Design a protein around this ligand. Structure first.
Ligand SMILES: [Mg+2]
Ligand SMILES: [Mg+2]
Lengths: 109, 224
């Protein structure tokens, strides 16, 4: 079962969404500085690195203002998380290109 | 070049014969044997068909096309109905509805009505494998759309370029700011939108700069 699909399952549980609603993806390159909380972006680490970003959406995600995302550096997994109604990023995973800083991937089962 | 507007064909056909372009084409042709590729062939160049190359007044540089079924159709930030607008486009609609009097969310994400008016919606990469974001990155499209940007830089005056995100910003970092308007801010993606995009007022600024430049403004509402 793909990561994508596990994050969907967790998000549909956490937020009471439709289990089978089709999710789409938006994929955007951006420097990490423009994308990650201050405390996670540091020189020699993420700062000034281009990330590949995936942001998931559907009708009910739109309606709830929930935007799950997965972040990559090259092909290295950098983050799994969601943005919420208030625009707080919440993370189930975050890795700074050196080591994990946050690991709660176990919630994805 | 099939499905490629003739007014554009006229001025850009110098590329079709360069080795990178011939390779690019062969790549995408091979790709279409093994994979569904978006946009389907007739829509790879929708941006050359919605308006004449001389009617172009506003340029918005995008990245790659949306990579699911019935999404991309040849215009950056645009999806075909009934597919929901992407989160970037939802934020563009938000800024609009504060920026532009009586702008209503049009309930869809087809930006064809902007295109027809001479808003050029130009992705940097013009194809993608279905379900694989970035899969046609760095195979020639970037040079092709760089050329489109250069042709525009050199063959027009007073365009308004909207550069959202550092990527589009590097792509536009050679536009002559003496002859062209360049407005820059964060990418409207939910991930970066609060770093400049909300409150950029680019749609009204463009309209003021177009009016100022002796040209007719964009009807941003001519979606609905
Ligand atoms: Mg948080
Ligand atoms: Mg891309």
């Amino acid at each position: 079962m793909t990561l994508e699909l596990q994050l969907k399952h967790y998000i549909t549980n956490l937020f009471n969404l439709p289990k089978d609603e089709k999710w789409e993806c938006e994929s955007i390159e951006e420097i990490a500085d423009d994308i990650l909380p201050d405390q996670y972006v540091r020189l020699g680490a993420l700062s000034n690195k281009i990330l590949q970003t995936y942001t998931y959406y559907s009708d009910t995600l739109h309606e709830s203002n929930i935007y799950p995302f997965i972040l990559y550096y090259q092909k290295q997994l950098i983050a799994i998380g969601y943005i919420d109604e208030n625009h707080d990023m919440d993370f189930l995973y975050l890795h700074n290109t050196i080591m994990p800083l946050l690991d709660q991937r176990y919630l994805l089962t | 070049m099939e499905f490629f507007g003739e007014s554009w064909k006229k001025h850009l056909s110098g590329e079709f014969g360069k080795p990178y372009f011939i390779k690019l084409m062969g790549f995408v042709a091979e790709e279409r044997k093994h994979y569904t590729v978006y946009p389907p062939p007739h829509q790879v160049f929708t941006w050359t068909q919605m308006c004449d190359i001389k009617d172009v007044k506003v340029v918005i540089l995008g990245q790659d096309p949306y990579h699911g079924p019935n999404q991309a159709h040849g215009l950056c930030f645009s999806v075909q109905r009934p597919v929901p607008p992407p989160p970037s486009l939802e934020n563009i609609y938000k800024e609009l509805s504060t920026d532009i009097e009586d702008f209503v969310h049009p309930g869809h994400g087809d930006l064809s009505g902007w295109a027809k008016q001479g808003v050029l919606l130009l992705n940097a990469v013009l194809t993608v494998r279905a379900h694989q974001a970035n899969s046609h990155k760095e195979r020639g499209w970037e040079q092709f759309t760089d050329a489109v940007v250069s042709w525009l830089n050199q063959n027009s005056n007073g365009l308004v370029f909207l550069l959202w995100g550092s990527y589009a910003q590097k792509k536009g970092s050679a536009i002559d700011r003496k002859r062209h308007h360049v407005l820059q801010t964060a990418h409207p993606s939910p991930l970066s939108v609060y770093r400049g995009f909300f409150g950029c007022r680019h749609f009204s600024k463009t309209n003021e700069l177009l009016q100022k430049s002796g040209k007719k403004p964009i009807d941003w509402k001519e979606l609905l």
